[PDB]
Paper text:
In this study, two fungal chimeric class I TrTSs, Talaromyces verruculosus talaropentaene synthase (TvTS) and [name] macrophomene synthase (MpMS), were characterized. Both enzymes use dimethylallyl diphosphate and isopentenyl diphosphate or hexaprenyl diphosphate as substrates, representing the first examples, to our knowledge, of non-squalene-dependent triterpene biosynthesis. Structural analyses of the terpene cyclase domain of TvTS and full-length MpMS provide detailed insights into their catalytic mechanisms. In summary, a novel family of chimeric class I TrTSs converting HexPP into triterpenes was identified for which two subclasses can be distinguished.
Further insights into triterpene biosynthesis by PT–TC chimeric enzymes were obtained by cryo-electron microscopy (cryo-EM) of MpMS. The data obtained for full-length MpMS showed that the enzyme exclusively forms a hexamer, whereas PaFS forms octamers and hexamers with a ratio of 9:1. The overall structure of the MpMS-PT monomer is highly similar to the PaFS-PT cryo-EM and crystal structures, and the hexamer of MpMS-PT also superimposes well with the PaFS hexamer (root mean square deviation of 1.4–1.6 Å for 274 Cα atoms). Moreover, the active site of MpMS-PT is of suitable size for its product HexPP. Analysis of an MpMS D114A/N115A variant with an inactivated TC domain demonstrated that HexPP was produced by the PT domain. Interactions between the PT and TC domains in MpMS were further investigated by cross-linking the domains with glutaraldehyde. Additional electron densities were observed in cross-linked MpMS at each vertex of the PT hexamer with a different occupancy, suggesting that the orientation of the TC domain is flexible although its position was fixed by the cross-linking. Additionally, in the hexameric structure of MpMS, each TC domain is located close to a PT domain, with their active sites facing each other, which allows for direct transfer of HexPP from the PT domain to an adjacent TC domain. By contrast, MpMS lacks this tunnel but has an overall larger reaction chamber for full uptake of HexPP, thus allowing its unusual C1-VI cyclization.
Numbering used by the authors:
A (entry chain B), B (entry chain F), C (entry chain E), D (entry chain C), E (entry chain A), F (entry chain D): 397 to 453, 468 to 557, 564 to 588, 602 to 696
Amino acid sequence: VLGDEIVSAPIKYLESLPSKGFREAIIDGMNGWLNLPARSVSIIKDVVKHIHTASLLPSAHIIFGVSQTVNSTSYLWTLAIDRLSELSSPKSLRIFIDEVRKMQIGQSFDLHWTAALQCPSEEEYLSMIDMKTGGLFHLLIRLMIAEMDFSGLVSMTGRYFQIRDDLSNLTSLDEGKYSLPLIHALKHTKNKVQLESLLIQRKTQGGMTLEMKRLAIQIMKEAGSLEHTRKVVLELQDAVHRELAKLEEAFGQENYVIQLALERLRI
Amino acid sequence: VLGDEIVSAPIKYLESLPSKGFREAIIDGMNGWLNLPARSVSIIKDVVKHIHTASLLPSAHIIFGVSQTVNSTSYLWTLAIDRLSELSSPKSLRIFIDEVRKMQIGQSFDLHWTAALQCPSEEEYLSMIDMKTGGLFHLLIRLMIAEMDFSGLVSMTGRYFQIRDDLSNLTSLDEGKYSLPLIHALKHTKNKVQLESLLIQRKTQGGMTLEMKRLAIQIMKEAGSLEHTRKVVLELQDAVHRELAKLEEAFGQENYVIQLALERLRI
Amino acid sequence: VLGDEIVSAPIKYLESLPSKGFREAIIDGMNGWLNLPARSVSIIKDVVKHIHTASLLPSAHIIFGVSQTVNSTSYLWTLAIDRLSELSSPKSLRIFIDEVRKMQIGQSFDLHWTAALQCPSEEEYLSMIDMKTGGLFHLLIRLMIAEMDFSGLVSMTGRYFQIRDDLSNLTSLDEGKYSLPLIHALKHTKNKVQLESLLIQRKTQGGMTLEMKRLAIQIMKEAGSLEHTRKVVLELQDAVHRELAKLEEAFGQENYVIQLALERLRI
Amino acid sequence: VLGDEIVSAPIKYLESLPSKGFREAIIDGMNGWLNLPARSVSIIKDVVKHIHTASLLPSAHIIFGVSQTVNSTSYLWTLAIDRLSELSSPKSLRIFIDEVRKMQIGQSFDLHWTAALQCPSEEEYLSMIDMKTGGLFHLLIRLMIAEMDFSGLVSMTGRYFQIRDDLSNLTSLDEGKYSLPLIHALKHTKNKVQLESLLIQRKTQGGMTLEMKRLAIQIMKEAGSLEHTRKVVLELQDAVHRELAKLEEAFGQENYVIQLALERLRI
Amino acid sequence: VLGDEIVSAPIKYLESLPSKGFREAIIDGMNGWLNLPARSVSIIKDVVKHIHTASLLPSAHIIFGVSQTVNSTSYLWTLAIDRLSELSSPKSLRIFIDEVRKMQIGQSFDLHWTAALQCPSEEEYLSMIDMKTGGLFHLLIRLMIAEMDFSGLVSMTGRYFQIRDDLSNLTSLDEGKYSLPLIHALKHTKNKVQLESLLIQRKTQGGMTLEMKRLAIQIMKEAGSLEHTRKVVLELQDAVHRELAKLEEAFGQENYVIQLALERLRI
Amino acid sequence: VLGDEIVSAPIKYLESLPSKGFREAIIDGMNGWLNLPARSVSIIKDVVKHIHTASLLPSAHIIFGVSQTVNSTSYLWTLAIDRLSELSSPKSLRIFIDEVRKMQIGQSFDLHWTAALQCPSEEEYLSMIDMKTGGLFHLLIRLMIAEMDFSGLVSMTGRYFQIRDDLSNLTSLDEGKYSLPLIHALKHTKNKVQLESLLIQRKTQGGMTLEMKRLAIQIMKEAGSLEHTRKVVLELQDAVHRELAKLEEAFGQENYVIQLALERLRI
């Protein structure tokens, strides 16, 4: 008899590291608007956690290797679908599979843009982040509804989260991911050749050094990208706050925890 | 609008390479016993092909990289579950998830034994290969029945296939996988230290050279492992042929294509 | 007293390897049209050889290292300018420097396109090869005249030489240079993602394997690129042959050695 | 139309980094003795800067790669010769080419001594540094005169600058260059085998560690090399100061800026 | 004429680094019980130092390379046997060779356990450390006696020294050696798979990082290994102190320097 | 109880590979001149075999690693001294240790010359090979005599063996060892810089390629080194044959097996 002690080790490792439960907060804040049993909420939380963990997969692949990490990712997919199988709604499978399909397509495009050293436009990047990030958000929304319109709020929340994380990473690069400040700088700078060469050498050497990071940040600063993205974040935050109010006026109630979660992520 | 042309590229590469359709032959030979519509057979074939391809995932990761390969593996899981969702039977999901769980557990143990340089016993290795290989076989069987006892035939077929492949690889090592001849040699040889050191150096250097392969093969030959495994294969072949007859006498019919498929893999 | 025995060793190494004297043939065939002393022809030959050798710089950098190769390249530049200083014409320096500037700009663009993994258009590639290849050719022409119009013949000869070399290399890849068949295939193929991934992995691993080369060649063949480039070569050959006639009818003489050199490079 | 935006990027990168204008100070201090128009002084400054930059070529080859750096070095040579072509004197080309030849020969010997792990004598090292360093200095002198005897002052200044830089680097190794303290230590030490092994291992590993650097510095200190080189620096400083006076008494004027530049480099 | 200045350099390098003369203290404290001439004591000290240095052979192999280190190890063996040849006793050779044989067998087993990633039992590890460490100790004892029973004191002293060093290293891993806390943790922990994977990845990558070291130390702490080994050390210290008394009562004298040496290593 | 199964594995591996028993032939041919018991001859053969094997230590370090190989080398030294301890002569230890000391010094010089990239002279190389090779030969001779003058015959035989092996290796490089043809070429060639650069790049890259080997052999051939070494081999062979006769006339007997062994190594 062989048990699930080896395949579940990376899963039990990355599911114990602390994290800010923004998705957990949204789950705990939306069941107030439409009432659901505690078991359904727990099932939805488990499914969302499994999907996010599988998206993530020191790093777990450093401790456990690559092949074991891939096997554990497949096991995570199986666990998530098994947990989803217990829901009462009969259309949960279609929602799950199509949202996961969208997330996977967005992730593939995000990987390909970085690998091929081709910079996307702002519109293409926004569409990609919409897919990749809001797939989980409106999977959550659809699963909760099945067991008003939420597309605009989901899109604004995903964009706000992503570009706010971009500012938190830069203002406060070594992976080569094309963020919004990098996209803006690559089209509004005089040292375009220098920035392109920096990206090419980062790809070649496998990473960037501290001096290269300082030079790239300086080139970004002289282009004014770090202010344009801050203005974008301010606009997105205002859009999210105004989108939440339109939903609050239709249900005849105010969510005092979703607003608290948003205030915990203020600018 | 972003399409599935990047995520599906690795999938469309290994699904075009030719292969011996032994599983396809079994599918085409078992629906003769119990009749099924062509659409159900096509769906089952697609599901089995997707599961096998995901198990597999020049190598595709050489052409497309590692991250893209993992993302395409997740996409393959989603495609397989979506295709399975069209079946008429209501218990297909449970069969699918538990068989895939067994396959993943077996694969995890197979990876861990090679990584940790610990040789399993013959019985434990046989149990592992039963899980890992026959999971797909009796997933196929259960899916066809849902839309007599088959456990013995599945177990014997999986073992026969695996150790026959081991002989085809050896008699006619660079990955470090523990086969049956290696397990027998490691317990019935005088140059145990030399074989252990060869395995350790293969792990350290990332591969084995031609001279090391010749030395390992000669050590195996001097221990008589290559004849013990041939006797095991002969016994397994006889067991499979005698197990098929017991099923043929209960359905009141003879399968002239499963027998042909087995004859195509004679010794 | 320190001599030039170390700096000149890489120079004396590649100046002894045999080569097809197409440029030497052009020099020996055009001075028939306009007569020059033997000393001027020898000086022009030496200058052209030095420039070509500097453009080139087992490989010499394998035997002598990288830094010594760069120092020897600078020594080649100094030797070429010193040899040019002995010419009677007073405008040789301007011709030399502007033609060398054109060659260097073309080489820089050729390097950058390969490094950045960005495919040029056919017009851009043709302009780049015009600069890079015909810079030496019409440097030769201008120096010989100084001591009719030749721009069309020079451009046609440079393009014919370059794409003929491309066909000779392909029909009869590991460096990543964007040739004409590759440019045509990248815009007229169905397996665009596979070809792009092959190029990316070639850049990442530092080279391509035999199986990858076979796959890329087969992808190019399925797109019909290898026939389009052959048609282009035939058109360029006809253009060169018709361009030579217009020059032959203006000088009132026929060159029986330039035609022989072209016939030595027939298709 | 292809421009010089890629080839000139490494040039425009290192021409903006700050540096101590000792050569600029010498140019601005010697034109006081013999008067020249501002345009000639600017041309000489540009030529000297281009030659020094080409000699140099985070590091620019880290940001831009190796091939682009070599192409930009060739572009620097072309730019320097083009700028020199505007001078009124007719013998500027010969001075330029022979001084550049001397510099290149000295650099070749300096590279070969380090590569071959053969320690030069003190006289050979002094001759090499004379060539390599004073080539630029008396190129500057000859170009300025063309548009008294200066050989002794140039030699003394070059030696003083080089060994002063050696002391500034050591007293206040990872490249393997044979300095004066290393040459003295290798012939006046008891741990000769240890020092030779340290140099060999530095060559093999590609660099030296902090502990190896401390051990080498301690071995040098125990041999008294760091005091012998300081005495040499003091003697060279006195020689330079006494050589400047002999020139000041022949022109009937005192240079109050060359003396200031020397005082900025006091011991 | 070729001298021993290259072969003896690593020997003269590692014999000058300071060390705590515990073995020297034991030698100086045991000749008080049985009187010996100063020449014999010096010879025994030299032999013991040579044996220990050969066991050891920045690291000397970093400065001098690998082959030179092996040749110097052989030279150390020759020097030790030559020094031993001057002793008056006729059975010194047999004692020397059999004790060195025991030391080499213990070292071989210690290397093999780490290389093969197989954890020994506590009893087997204790036997291995007995051989490997106490071989030198009771070689020293036998050599001094030849020129009461000491086996128990030697065994207890060797074990106390080894596990005390283990605590000094851990409490106050990158080589993969199996200590006592690691052995206890690997059999009394819940995260067995994580610890095994950490060891496997340490072997694969050639070393461990700071985060991996912290994780391993925390896993050991949660298992209570660091307290079990401290209790073991306390028991061993008490055993050594009680074993010394039994020897002190038979010779009718008290050693005031061996006791001081033990007090210098209190807990 | 831990046995000698791990430490003796490389010893039992390299002592089973076939070899031409030239030293065995000399032992079997010289005991005819002076009669010795079979046990003494067997002991001497075992000691010589152990010393040669320790000198040697696919390669055994490839199969078993480096640390295990060093431990087995130390075990070989212990085994050789233990076997020598059974001889009846009382001065065997001094002969053994001083001859082994000479061999080790010669090996150290041979390693250092290759590591430091410094070419020895012909006389110094001959002295080094005399030490390193004839140490074993006249250790054998002295051991047999203890249980006429043989220095000249031993020296001539060692030189003949070594240069014959070098000539056979070259005429019929990747390790960097300075042979006699290489030493002669480095002082009698025109492409000295090219050969030195080839050696430096061989050291840097860790080995030489086939084209580099062909180039080096061609440079050697153009220098006439391959004929000078053949003349040296012929002279050494004549010297050995004339030295054997002088010994044959003093013992009043002819050795019909030493002459056979020499004839088996004719030119």
